[PDB]
Design a binder for this molecule. Sequence first.
Ligand code: SF4
Ligand code: NA
Length: 353
Amino acid sequence: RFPAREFQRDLLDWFARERRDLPWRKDRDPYKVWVSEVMLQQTRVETVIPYFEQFIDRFPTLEALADADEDEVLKAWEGLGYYSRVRNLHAAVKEVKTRYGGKVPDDPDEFSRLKGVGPYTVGAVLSLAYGVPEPAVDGSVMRVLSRLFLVTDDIAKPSTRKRFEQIVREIMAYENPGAFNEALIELGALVCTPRRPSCLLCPVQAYCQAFAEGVAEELPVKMKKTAVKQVPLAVAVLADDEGRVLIRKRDSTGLLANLWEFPSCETDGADGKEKLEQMVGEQGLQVELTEPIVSFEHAFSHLVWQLTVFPGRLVHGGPVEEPYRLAPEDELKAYAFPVSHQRVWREYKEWAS
DNA sequence: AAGACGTGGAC
DNA sequence: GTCCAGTCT
Ligand code: SF4
Ligand code: NA
């Protein structure tokens, strides 16, 4: 029904000619392939490249990552977003070392069991690093296959991904699965792009039903994103006479987990300075707050923070208890802060000067 | 199933 | 402004 060999030949030959020389493509070490694949989840290649180089220089082997402190690993991810990815990777490499002696499982079922590894990552790492013929369907590959085969099912449904995986299992080049899987990904990045695909240059134009019917710009089908909640947030920047600043570590469950922040309160529409003073008072801390110096927004995928920054002076009436920490200005650089709170500090320092 | 979960480009 | 670059729950 489908001329698989003709398709594979046109695809893999194109790939050998156009493949980009990306940093994680220098070899097939499973640890390096796995790190790159996790960083690339909902993150563009050009964004990842500098993070990857810095991460692998700090954590050159799987055992190095496993043996590192969680705060050092989070700092190496700082700014990349979706920070549970790195907490899950860190737990997963620890299990690979403790349990499997440091060798990344080559069994799909075993690799699939590690935290942060789902169907795409299983297929990506095992096909590239070990030759295992598991499909590696990400959103780009879903777009490619939805066009090639004129599939109009919503690609957000998990069932749709399962259908695409079966398609790949039938058309795959079982002789070189890693190259086949990489080539579909590279086709989606360089040719079969979300808007204005370059169908006239495409190596597999011969086999594309969407091109035949003239509807490539209309695939894949995907539900429009649900609007997000708006969340007002009040943030205190508190310094003592010696210049040190009060920061606190977020809880390990939920939004921006285990990152550091300036003390803050979801006002839920209430007065900021009032609610902020109640919260700090609950702790050795005597604090008087200033009028707000700036307000700005910060987007997440699922909500938007509306931040207002309030300066204040801290006088020590007791010890600073966890989760809080008193940090000299010169030491703040050592802590991993979300981008929102990086901006809080930037705005505080511009106002001060 | 569908919401939680960051951030930044390209239109 | 919209859309795009997976996994846990
Ligand atoms: S012909 Fe166009 S729509 Fe079809 S796979 Fe190639 S770039 Fe995509
Ligand atoms: Na998993």
